[PDB]
Design a protein around this ligand. Structure first.
Ligand SMILES: Cc1cc2nc3c(=O)[nH]c(=O)nc-3n(C[C@H](O)[C@H](O)[C@H](O)COP(=O)(O)O)c2cc1C
Ligand code: SF4
Ligand code: SF4
Ligand code: SF4
Ligand code: FES
Ligand code: FES
Ligand SMILES: [Mg+2]
Ligand SMILES: [Mg+2]
Ligand SMILES: [Mg+2]
Ligand SMILES: [Mg+2]
Ligand SMILES: [Mg+2]
Ligand SMILES: [Mg+2]
Ligand SMILES: [Mg+2]
Ligand SMILES: [Mg+2]
Lengths: 156, 148, 907
């Protein structure tokens, strides 16, 4: 069972009056609910749909369209490396290999215990600076396959 | 700027409200499109819209709307503050103004710089960006982002 | 308005897109995402045509037909090599991910994707890689779900959400992994979700009711028939195969239900395939039953009827114009009793009077989508006649179209029209005893008893004209709402008023009549629609009889010693105790019916009548449009011993055997002539369809596709010598393919839509003059009456305020789409869908007793002591109780009556 907390419901209701249409707060409501819990559970869809005033179908379409609104159980510290043209050139492949050799998983999976999900991301908009990756909200650039272990040991 | 009078109801004497908001969205590249950004801001799936009607006549919520990039909008303060002619004359190219240009890739000094919009691509690669680094040979290049 | 297509020069409406115009001209352009009812979106990219300029531009540019305005100086070319190659490659891209299952797809020879793949000339696979796959959902007991076959054309979502306002279906995912279904498994809530089976071009959404007993489209045998589950005349085309109704498909009618049906009419047809239907006239010789012949049955019935002191007849409001008449002739005009209660009839003839003698134009079902304001005063339009609810939903979106046309936006660009609207709608003020399904779009809903709704209507009609009767005592908080309704109706240029008979109140109907008269006196071209209970309810009101109460009074008195009940069950129009006590003391009870009702267990003779599927006649809908339905198949075929003649055929032959002593099985046209000769009010049913001997170039119209299969083997198990095809002397159709069904044929009764290259429902583009317009050569219907010069007076009778009585509970009618119809509820498919019986209660009155949310409750209305669960209804007014009308055990006649004692279940 799912029910919206008081803090996140209040934040959604405060976001709903930044726009002319309540619907417009849908992405921000999903991001609030995800911030609190790490992902958007199946009941959060209907809860947000009841708070805003739009159906659960629209909220579920918004949540499954965008790639940073997780609809499946994701660990903590959702690692997102970049694999686009500028990074492909700078060698993000070695960075992905040293990441999935240390986490012992494949891109798209949790590790064992609910920490260090591994995902690829479109581009982090920091191309001139080596292969990049974000862990949760910290952008890490100039990545070297030697410094992946020590950089992962900072997140517990 | 809100606390200092530069934003809010009565901005520096003249009657002009302009409340300013920020919308940090989820990660989809298609929301960068001019008329898919409008859909995403409306809280819907970021699907582009057919033109005409242009966003200028019917845009955000059926109201008029002009979508502008960041650098375009950063260009305007200097135009107004220094003058239209000064901006007209920065350099003798038919694309007036300055531009943020840079070289990415395995160059000796990647980054971006502000250039007079008539600079040869070789003048950015070897003078500013340094050139290919230590044993690498140039093969090709894309002018602009991926998609050119 | 003068385009050039491939050198040829045509004349088109310059106000619609190039796809619409080119399809109206007869040209062939492939298209998946365009629908003539859902506007144009450029999603699929499959209707590409090269566009030039200057008439000498040799290098045009590819552009989508459905999105270009088709203005005057337009030069295009459908056949350009580049356009051909792009259109072909566009289907190749769709075929990259398609599932190799045409043989097992529910719709082969009916699929639009097959049509367009053969049309674009693509019959070679260059793709080599894997296909994307998808898991299905459980959408209900009606329609299936196979997302492997989706081409992402967006028609389902556009229809279901932007058109029908569904709210429980959308699109999910992105980037070639897109998905169209419900957010979670569960049944689809929308009443009009059946139309997804033909809106979707592929076999993603296909109905289960036909998927169980399946047959390819060619094997089907169609005929133009009318939906019989509702007061509207939605034109259907039922298909038969191996002697049983397989499915009910939509039959275009540009004046009534252009492209869409209900679910009650599309899926509630399963009551004709029941294995307990009467198939031979049987006689009850004391306790035993003996099957009779046709001539034997007629001779016996006439011998018993000729010795009777008086014979009365009880026709029903679900027969046909002839069946009732035919009966009327059998018993005398005097002895014919309309099989509806007195109060059920008074407010039916009042609605008929408002439609005929009230000088206000009653719109057709498609003209409802053109009115500014709507006031649904007393009707649950969504549950009784639901296509009117969809029409209202289309009418409330009119303000977005006005805002778009004021900005020079074309009327086919639906995305821009919706974007400009931004949830701005025309005013709509629903009114009912509790919540409705039109509350999401209504501006204000009034939840009150059927007396307070009439008081509101009278208050509106007084605030509009100031000569109508005043209500004298409304309280100022409601006045501020009556004021908004008035300000919104008097300002609208085309208001509509939709009352009905289902509300169970005469005051509601006359209040709506007062509102409409005040508006007409103000100047606006106001329309008025009245929803009746059952198909052909209007025809029974036009013809008229005494009542059911008078018939039962004659029966339980020794005055009438015989009765012929025609297509009536008599238990949902009166008390099942009085009906049985009357029919018990009758030395003759004939029951001409096509179902196995309860009154035919003590019936001395049960003539096996025919259903709508295998019967001919005409039924008049709510606007007085006399439409004719045709026989789909011959019941006798596959079963030689099956005399299932039509009701009017039984009654005419019985009347003949009564006087003549010799049987006379007449023809449909003779019965129609008799009606139009004896009842002048129905003189318009003769023009509803051409009689027999109507031929198209000598040929008569065909009931089966040209390539109908299995002709010399489908009846081989019974006997290898195939019989002669059944003879249709009634109508202009033949029970074979040796007939004519061409788009350009000069007739307006189309059994099914097929054109060479267009197998699917999209073959209806070839049958209409301009796609989305009326059927070429008109639409099959004749309104019986036209608006009068002078209207009725104001009804100077305001009902007093509803004050609840202690110890009595006024029954508030709750109508359900599934289960509130006498015949649809019998379909074994609606048993899964219909709700469980209940009795709604106000919380203030549920807590007044000990009953809580689910506790059974016993109540007495008559002899019967029913016991139903309890649901809490917050919107229902205090001194009322809700009851599911029509649902078995609760007769719709229980609307406005008050049950005298209600208590806990007393377990
Ligand atoms: C697929 C696609 C992605 C785009 N992404 C961006 C973007 O990320 N940032 C941006 O400023 N413009 C982007 N654009 C261009 C915009 O549509 C728009 O022209 C621009 O943001 C504002 O117009 P301006 O360049 O005149 O200021 C994109 C266009 C397309 C077709
Ligand atoms: S949807 Fe049409 S094309 Fe696709 S498998 Fe079914 S019949 Fe064949
Ligand atoms: S499910 Fe059917 S109607 Fe919906 S997008 Fe797919 S093919 Fe089109
Ligand atoms: S609206 Fe009435 S007539 Fe039309 S399909 Fe539905 S039930 Fe049948
Ligand atoms: S491509 Fe990786 S930072 Fe841009
Ligand atoms: S029908 Fe025109 S783009 Fe699909
Ligand atoms: Mg603009
Ligand atoms: Mg048009
Ligand atoms: Mg499955
Ligand atoms: Mg399943
Ligand atoms: Mg889903
Ligand atoms: Mg389909
Ligand atoms: Mg007759
Ligand atoms: Mg017949």
């Amino acid at each position: 069972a799912f029910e919206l907390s008081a803090a996140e419901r209040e934040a959604i209701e405060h976001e709903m009056h930044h726009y002319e249409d309540p619907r417009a707060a849908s992405i921000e409501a999903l991001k609030i609910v995800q911030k609190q819990r790490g992902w958007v559970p199946d009941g959060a869809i209907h809860a947000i749909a009841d708070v805003l005033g739009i159906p659960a179908s629209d909220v579920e379409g918004v949540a499954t369209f965008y790639s940073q609104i997780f609809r499946q159980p994701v660990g903590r510290h959702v690692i997102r490396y970049c694999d686009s043209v500028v990074c492909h050139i700078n060698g993000y492949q070695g960075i992905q290999a040293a990441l999935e050799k240390k986490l012992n998983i494949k891109p798209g999976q949790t590790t064992f215990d609910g920490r260090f999900t591994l995902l690829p991301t479109c581009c982090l908009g920091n191309c001139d600076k080596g292969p990049n990756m974000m862990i949760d909200e910290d952008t890490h650039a100039h990545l070297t396959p030697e410094a992946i272990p020590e950089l992962l040991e900072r997140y517990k | 700027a809100t606390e200092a009078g530069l934003l809010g109801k009565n901005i520096m004497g003249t009657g002009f409200d302009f409340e300013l908001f920020v919308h940090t969205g989820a990660g989809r590249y298609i929301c960068g499109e001019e008329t898919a950004l409008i859909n995403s801001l409306e809280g819907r799936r970021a699907n582009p819209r057919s033109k005409p009607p242009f966003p200028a006549t019917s845009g955000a919520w059926g109201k008029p709307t002009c979508v502008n990039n960041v650098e375009t909008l950063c260009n305007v303060p200097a135009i107004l503050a220094n003058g239209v002619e000064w901006y007209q004359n920065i350099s003798k190219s038919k694309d007036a103004g300055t531009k943020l240009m840079g070289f990415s890739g395995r160059v000796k000094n990647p980054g971006l710089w502000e250039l007079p919009f008539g600079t040869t691509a070789r003048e950015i690669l070897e003078d500013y960006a340094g050139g290919m680094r230590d044993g690498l040979k140039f093969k090709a290049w894309q002018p602009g982002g991926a998609g050119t | 308005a003068t385009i050039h297509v491939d050198g040829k020069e045509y004349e088109v409406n310059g106000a619609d897109n190039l796809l619409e115009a080119c399809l109206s001209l007869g040209l062939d352009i492939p298209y998946f995402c365009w629908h003539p009812a859902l506007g144009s979106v450029g999603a699929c990219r499959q209707c590409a045509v090269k566009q030039y300029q200057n008439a000498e531009d040799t290098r045009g540019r590819l552009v989508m037909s459905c999105m270009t305005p088709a203005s005057d100086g337009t030069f295009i070319s459908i056949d350009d090599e580049e356009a051909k190659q792009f259109r072909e490659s566009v289907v190749e891209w769709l075929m990259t991910n398609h599932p190799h299952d045409c043989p097992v797809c529910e719709e082969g020879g009916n699929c639009h994707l097959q049509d367009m793949t053969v049309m674009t000339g693509h019959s070679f696979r260059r793709y080599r890689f894997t296909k994307r796959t998808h898991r299905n959902q459980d959408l209900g007991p009606f329609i299936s779900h196979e997302m492997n076959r989706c081409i992402a054309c967006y028609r389902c979502v556009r229809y279901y959400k932007d058109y029908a306002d569904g709210t429980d279906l959308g699109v999910y995912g992105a980037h070639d992994n897109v998905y169209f279904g419900r957010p979670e498994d569960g049944t689809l809530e929308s009443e009009f979700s059946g139309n997804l089976v033909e809106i979707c071009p592929t076999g993603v959404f296909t109905d289960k009711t036909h998927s169980e007993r399946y047959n390819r489209k060619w094997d089907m045998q169609f005929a133009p028939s009318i939906c019989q589950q509702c007061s509207i005349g939605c034109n259907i085309s039922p298909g038969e195969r191996y002697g049983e109704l397989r499915r009910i498909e939509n039959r275009y009618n540009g004046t009534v239900n252009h492209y869409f049906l209900c679910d009650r009419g599309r899926f509630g047809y399963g009551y004709v395939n029941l294995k307990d239907r009467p198939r031979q006239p049987v006689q009850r010789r004391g306790d035993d039953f003996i099957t009779l012949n046709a001539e034997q049955a007629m001779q016996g019935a006439a011998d018993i009827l000729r010795q009777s002191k008086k014979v009365i007849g009880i026709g029903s409001p679900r027969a046909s114009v002839e069946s009732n008449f035919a009966l009327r002739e059998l018993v005398g005009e005097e002895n014919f009793y309309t099989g509806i209660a007195h109060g059920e009839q008074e407010r039916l003839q009042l609605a008929l009077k408002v439609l005929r003698e009230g000088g206000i134009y009653t719109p057709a079902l498609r003209e409802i989508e053109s009115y500014d304001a709507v006031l649904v005063l007393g009707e649950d339009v969504t549950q009784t006649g639901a296509r009117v609810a969809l029409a209202v939903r289309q009418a409330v979106k009119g303000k977005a179209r006005e805002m778009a046309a004021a900005q020079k936006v074309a009327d086919w660009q639906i995305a821009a029209i919706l974007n400009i609207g931004q949830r701005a709608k025309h005013p709509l003020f629903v009114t009912n005893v509790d919540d409705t399904r039109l509350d999401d779009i209504a501006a204000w809903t009034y939840r009150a008893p059927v007396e307070d709704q009439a008081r509101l209507g009278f208050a509106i009609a007084h605030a509009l004209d100031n000569s109508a009767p005043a209500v004298d005592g409304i309280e100022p908080e409601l006045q501020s709402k009556i004021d908004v309704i008035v300000q919104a109706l008097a300002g609208a240029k085309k208001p509509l008023i939709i009352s009905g008979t289902n509300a169970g109140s005469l005051e509601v109907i006359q209040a709506a009549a007062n509102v409409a008269k005040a508006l007409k006196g103000r100047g606006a071209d106001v329309g008025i629609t009245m929803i009746a209970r059952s198909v052909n309810s209007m025809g029974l009101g036009i013809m008229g009889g005494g009542s059911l109460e008078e018939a039962l009074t004659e029966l339980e008195t020794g005055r009438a010693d015989a009765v012929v009940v025609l297509e009536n069950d008599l238990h949902r129009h009166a008390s099942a105790i009085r009906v049985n006590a009357a029919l018990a003391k009758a030395p003759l009870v004939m029951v001409v019916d096509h179902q196995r009702t309860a009154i035919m267990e003590n019936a001395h003779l049960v003539l096996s009548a025919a259903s709508f599927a295998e019967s001919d006649g005409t039924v008049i809908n709510n606007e007085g449009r006399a439409q004719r339905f045709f026989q789909v198949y011959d019941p006798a075929y596959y079963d030689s011993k099956t005399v299932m003649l039509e009701s009017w055929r039984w009654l005419h032959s019985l009347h003949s055997t009564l006087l003549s002593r010799e049987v006379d099985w007449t023809q449909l046209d003779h019965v129609i002539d008799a009606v139009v000769a004896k009842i002048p009010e129905l003189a318009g049913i003769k023009d509803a369809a051409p009689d027999a001997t109507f031929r198209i170039r000598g040929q008569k119209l065909a009931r089966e596709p040209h390539r109908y299969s299995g002709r010399t083997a489908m009846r081989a198990n019974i006997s290898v010598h195939e019989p002669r095809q059944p003879q249709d002397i009634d109508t202009m159709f033949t029970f074979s393919m040796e007939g004519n069904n061409q788009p350009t044929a000069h007739r307006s009764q189309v059994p099914f839509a097929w054109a060479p290259g267009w197998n699917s429902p999209q073959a209806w583009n070839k049958f209409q003059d301009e796609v989305g317009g009326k059927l070429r050569f008109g639409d099959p219907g004749v309104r019986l009456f036209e608006t009068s010069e002078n209207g009725l007076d104001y009804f100077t009778s305001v009902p007093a305020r509803f004050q609840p009585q202690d110890g009595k509970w006024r029954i508030a009618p709750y109508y359900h789409l599934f289960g509130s119809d006498e015949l649809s509820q019998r379909a074994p498919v609606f048993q899964s869908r219909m709700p469980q019986p209940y009795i709604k209660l106000n919380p203030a009155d549920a807590a007044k007793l000990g009953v809580n949310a689910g506790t059974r409750v016993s109540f007495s209305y008559d002899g019967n002591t029913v016991t139903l669960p309890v649901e809490i209804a917050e919107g229902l007014t205090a001194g009322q109780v809700g009851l599911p009308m029509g649902m078995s055990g609760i007769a719709p006649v229980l609307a406005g009556a008050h049950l005298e004692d209600l208590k806990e279940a007393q377990q």
